[PDB]
């Protein structure tokens, strides 16, 4: 038996569980989307390639740190890469391009401006923090400057301040009408413009800085595919982000990162205004408690599974691979866990951006993934789908579960939707059928965009409309069929859906057929 | 609401998912038990002392490495904390001292002559491996040492073998007639008697080695609770460690170690033989790809759910703390997600035995697991267990699901288990309680075993048998009330179960009462 | 095999029903409780004797009809039948008196004069209705009377009138100030006295008139069970029944009997104001169309087994057998199905109260409702009865729950329960075991009213309160046995639950054993 295929008839969870079998080879399609960060160790248009090959579907760009045209420069190395391999379309692979705001970031300021100097910070001793920029190079063991104007008005004595992502904790003593009193809680040797945290503090700087403003802007002018909007705090936020791309970037997706405590409790509200989450682990776990982010993880995977919205888990997935050419067993289960979770996307920072083996972090995650899928439980997850979603009269949407209900009772090779926006391929992957989805476009920016939804492998078209509807279609299919036996998903004899509009421009997708593969 | 009791309620696994919700606070009891490795960084008896008020149920001792004497000492000093708690009966907590045999190990020698610590070899670099006994001081970057003979009885040319937890990877390049050259494919940094597998060979060596059978004598001999044997394969292999221990040691557990391909794939008869078992996941995930683990993992966990038997989930849970303070977010997700699994221990190696915060590592599981055991969907756990298991006409099964169902319908604060060989406390833990077990034992042995089953909170009580039946068991009843109290499980006015027997002996389990706490 | 045993571990309903055997013999016990109309047919003390080793377990009487001395020597006779029986306490059944008022029924005058001649109506044919009392005694095929003074407001043109409990129906042509001329729809011979029925009409008759009251009153005076309260409309109209039967008949159960559209409209506010419910087929398959009675029948029986309180599904069950000694098709399957629908009661009408065969019918009920029970899906009955029943901090509650698993675990020959009040014995009930639940008490009054409760066999102590309570309990569990083994319902080495309280007097039911039958 194949793709825990034996598992997958269980009637209960827990004799699926007993029947997983790591000698049930999976399918060779893998459904999970992988968001890589690029930086040092990945922005080469050689290594690039490599990285398509291993299985990159999004490259995320940081816009924490690094110049517009640092990044402009980044962008084309990747649009090179992509490209390289455009002249076979049958094996082409679309490679979305994700840009991630600074957002409300608080940061120190530089130590002694020397660069190879730290302080060591011990534990009980004072320090004063102060917002007077004649300090704002000049920082040490009894001054520290940050950018925060307003710092002294959100915050109260007792309050914790986390500096260096977490890893040094200061305890305020005494307000001054601009500057505060800390003292050290946790020691540690702090550098220069280091990350600053203060969980549980209604922070007031804007969703939208002037920064990002120019940031989005810049995305808009690149042709970004989507963006990762830091700190999102309540719907305003994401409303914000959604005002300044405008217009002109009205179909760039807007994924909200929820990374602190606010953003957890009105997550309701986020979701209904965004296009899709990350579940951002990295700020989140300084911001609430460590023991605690697997509930907020699930929680929103949950939510998001249920809305019918991708959701991306991130952050440290496989960290001990920045360093190291295997993972340890926690990061093996991690990102499995994540996709049994229903994360549609994982993402790698630090193991593809700068660490020491960029490619064999990529290949891992193409290899769990793969091997979780599998082992899902589409039995249970598909009539608990179901029955928390509502009654439509949206005739795509009835057709893409009674074509998920058909690809489970005749085990089929792939769905292959025809797609313009999209859509279509979407209301089929909220469904989560086991075959992977085709999704046959022309538009380029449809086939980067749907990286984002679990199942899909995008493909574009190039070839020109014929004016003929039916023979039009024809070579959508067929294309489909193609690249279904070029990339092992099936063979000629097996059976496939095939979801089609009825009519030339219907812009429904309400047409199903069994058909046999060619 | 308290103890994600919102999520509780939930219809569907999936609407449980979104309900979880961080600002919902865990009970104070901690139903998983906690295994931890002691060695040089936690072999004081001023540090163990910390181990115990931290949360550490079971001692293990590796025999991987020491002396007799050496572990003579350890044992007296994990003997000498537990009973400095013994004064305040009320406060005591048993504490289990497991064995975990070396087994059939291959391992490498010391560093070139000059410094016999720490060295390296280069990446893609060539490597001479040797099958004659000279080399052992003087193993580099050039020529190593393995302990294995009859080798290339069972191997092949362009094999894979790995080194050092199997950071080190090399294929033979070529090999003769029993010797050793090979080509570095993953390069990192080579240290001093580093452990080697061979994926895919049936090796030779025997389950239980002469040295094996000295350690369990000694074992025997220091009155230990229980053994983990190492690379278990067969049924047969348990049956000689349970002949070793013999008569004398006929009380002692053992709990299998499953870590290659052959004790996965004969889990069941190997599950059958053995008193519980162990997901050794360091050498699992290099025996078998690292991308299957989870599902071995979740398999072996399932079985034994369904079984009645203790598993353990272990190494690398926290791998990052032996370093750090805080753990990273993959190790806060798979402690989370072994008890989600539904292991009954989860284990610390390295984190307690040699790194620089054992304290803090066994904190952090502490708190992992309770909030990990709040999150658990126990309606749909407990309606499987039911249904999954076989009928019976025994008493006492009848009167320990009885005790389940009603410890859910009025939410107790625990479920007090009078037992003497603990068979009683067992039963009603196989059937996973939300409420902590309060198994209350005269005899300190099985109070010490007890901690390998979730959920059970084991009592020793020190005072002397009653003539009169119900007095003496009034008397055992109290005590768990008096321990519950003190460790905030419950409160005066609230609802406990009581489980108790008819007369005294084993087997005669048959009466439940749902009691006030005094 | 046995009581359905096979279906009742089928994972599905469908396949539940596919293994149904009519070779599967049921087990002795009937769990279903059998109410019969005490008639002319019936009312001999020897008749009566017959009704009760057939299986009658409550003597309804019908107040429309017959001077209080003459119920009084009915109710007489009903003992007298009961405490022939009584010699042996091991034997001894007890029998309810039920009595149903008459209510607001609304009743035509006499025929003809002629004694008690039957006019026959013709369809097309002319009739008038009249309040002129002076056609109070003489009725006849042109011009009919009836004792309703208001009809004339509440009825309109258009308006159908039914005859007869339903037989002849009438269709209102013209309204006068005095009296209504109707075309009649159907022929048939019209009696003196019959009953008449409005459909869509807002009748104002009081629901507790004059009469209802001296009648209550007599209820009380004569220590009656139970009063079936007729054709209440709304919450108010229970509690003035409640009053009426105040201080001295505060025991006494009131069954509301929901005969109406209103009834059922305002259901919900009736249940929480009664004891339990009636459904009351004759009248409400009048007041509403017949076509809507089975998704009523089937709304209330759901709600009473949800809110835990009796339900008596009554009228027509066995209609043909007034005249024959074989039943239809229809009627065998009408009482099987309203055992499985979840009725506590079946009742019996025209059958044993003016019928050719009132013991033949009375055993017939009891064959049908013994193989329905067999039928039950318990796995799924059961599973669901929990999910919607509360977390509740009552200790009798959890036993109670507790007890009920343990009797599906060990598959029990009963559940025995010591009760002063019943309500012990209520909450078993409520969760619908497969085991008879033997109900131990000393009060003679709820050994009689626990025959509303679906699966209860009461039986009465006699012996004198012993003055260690432990011995006292043994005494009445004891005699439970003995009971037990003597109807056939165990043997000795069978395994049965006990529940018993931790000192004397209600509301202290808490402990629950397993035992073996000595
Ligand atoms: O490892 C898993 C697991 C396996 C697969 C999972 N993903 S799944 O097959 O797609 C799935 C299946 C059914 C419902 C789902 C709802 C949301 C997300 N995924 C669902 C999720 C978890 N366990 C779930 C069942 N287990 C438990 C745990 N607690 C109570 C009952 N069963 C043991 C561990
Ligand atoms: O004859 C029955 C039936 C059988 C048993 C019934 N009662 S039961 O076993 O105690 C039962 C079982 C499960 C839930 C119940 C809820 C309320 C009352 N009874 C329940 C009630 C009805 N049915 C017709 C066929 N049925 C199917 C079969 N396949 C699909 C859907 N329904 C089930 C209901
Ligand atoms: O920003 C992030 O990606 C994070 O904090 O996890
Ligand atoms: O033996 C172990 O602990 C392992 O390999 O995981
Ligand atoms: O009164 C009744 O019992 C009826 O109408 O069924
Ligand atoms: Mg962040
Ligand atoms: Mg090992
Ligand atoms: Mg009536």
Same mark, same amino acid.
């Given at each position: 038996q194949t793709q825990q295929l034996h598992a997958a008839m269980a009637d209960t969870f827990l004799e699926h569980m007993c029947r997983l079998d790591i000698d049930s080879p999976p399918i060779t399609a893998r459904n999970t989307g992988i968001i890589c960060t690029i930086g040092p160790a990945s922005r080469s248009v050689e290594t690039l390639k490599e990285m398509i090959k291993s299985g990159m579907n999004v490259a995320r760009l940081n816009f924490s740190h690094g110049t517009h045209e640092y990044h402009a420069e980044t962008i084309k190395n990747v649009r090179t890469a992509t490209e390289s391999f455009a002249s076979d379309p049958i094996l082409y692979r679309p490679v979305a391009v994700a840009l991630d705001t600074k957002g409300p970031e608080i940061r120190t300021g530089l130590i002694k401006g020397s660069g190879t100097a730290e302080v060591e910070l011990k534990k009980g001793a004072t320090l004063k923090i102060?917002?007077?920029?004649?300090?704002?190079?000049?920082?040490?063991?009894?001054?520290?400057?940050?950018?925060?104007?307003?710092?002294?008005?959100?915050?109260?004595?007792?309050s914790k301040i986390y500096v260096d992502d977490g890893l040094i904790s200061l305890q305020v003593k005494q307000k001054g009408a601009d500057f505060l009193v800390t003292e050290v809680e946790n020691g540690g040797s702090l550098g220069s413009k280091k990350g600053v945290n203060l969980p549980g503090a209604a922070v007031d700087?804007?969703?939208?800085?002037?920064?990002?403003?120019?940031?989005?802007?810049?995305?808009?002018?690149?042709?970004?595919?989507?963006?990762?909007?830091?700190?999102?705090?309540?719907?305003?936020?994401?409303?914000?982000?959604?005002?300044?791309?405008?217009?002109?970037?009205?179909? *760039?997706? *807007?994924?909200?990162? *929820?990374?602190?405590?606010?953003?957890?409790?009105?997550?309701?509200?986020?979701?209904?205004?965004?296009?899709?989450?990350?579940?951002?682990?990295?700020?989140?776990?300084?911001? *609430?408690? +460590?023991?605690?982010?697997?509930? +907020?993880?699930?929680?929103?995977?949950?939510?998001?599974?249920?809305?019918?919205?991708?959701?991306?888990?991130?952050?440290?997935?496989?960290?001990?691979?920045?360093?190291?050419?295997?993972?340890?067993?926690?990061?093996?289960?991690?990102?499995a866990n994540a996709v049994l979770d229903g994360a549609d996307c994982?993402?790698?920072?630090?193991?593809?951006?700068?660490?020491?083996?960029?490619?064999?972090?990529?290949?891992?995650?193409?290899?769990? +993934?793969?091997?979780?899928?599998?082992?899902?439980?589409?039995?249970?997850?598909?009539?608990?789908?179901?029955?928390?979603?509502?009654?439509?009269?949206?005739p795509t949407e009835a057709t893409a579960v009674g074509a998920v209900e058909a690809s489970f009772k005749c085990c089929s090779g792939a769905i292959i939707v025809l797609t313009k926006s999209g859509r279509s391929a979407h209301q089929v992957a909220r469904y989560r059928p086991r075959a992977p989805i085709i999704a046959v476009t022309r538009?380029?920016?449809?086939?980067?965009?749907?990286?984002?939804?679990?199942?899909?492998?995008?493909?574009?078209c190039k070839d020109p409309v014929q004016e003929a509807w039916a023979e039009d279609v024809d070579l959508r299919v067929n294309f489909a069929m193609n690249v279904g036996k070029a990339r092992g998903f099936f063979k000629k004899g097996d059976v496939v859906i095939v979801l089609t509009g009825w009519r030339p421009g219907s812009g429904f997708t309400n047409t199903m057929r069994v058909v046999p593969v060619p």
């Open positions: 102060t917002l007077d920029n004649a300090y704002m190079e000049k920082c040490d063991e009894n001054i520290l400057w940050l950018d925060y104007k307003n710092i002294c008005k959100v915050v109260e004595v007792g700087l804007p969703a939208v800085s002037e920064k990002d403003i120019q940031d989005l802007k810049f995305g808009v002018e690149q042709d970004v595919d989507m963006v990762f909007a830091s700190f999102i705090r309540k719907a305003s936020d994401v409303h914000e982000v959604r005002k300044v791309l405008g217009e002109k970037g009205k179909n *760039i997706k *807007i994924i909200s990162k *929820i990374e602190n405590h606010e953003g957890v409790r009105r997550f309701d509200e986020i979701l209904e205004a965004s296009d899709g989450i990350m579940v951002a682990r990295g700020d989140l776990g300084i911001e *609430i408690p +460590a023991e605690k982010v697997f509930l +907020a993880q699930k929680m929103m995977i949950g939510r998001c599974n249920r809305a019918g919205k991708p959701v991306i888990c991130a952050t440290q997935m496989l960290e001990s691979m920045i360093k190291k050419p295997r993972p340890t067993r926690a990061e093996g289960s991690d990102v994982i993402m790698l920072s630090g193991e593809t951006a700068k660490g020491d083996y960029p490619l064999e972090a990529v290949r891992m995650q193409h290899l769990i +993934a793969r091997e979780a899928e599998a082992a899902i439980y589409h039995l249970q997850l598909f009539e608990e789908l179901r029955r928390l979603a509502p009654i439509t009269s949206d538009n380029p920016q449809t086939a980067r965009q749907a990286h984002l939804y679990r199942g899909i492998f995008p493909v574009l």
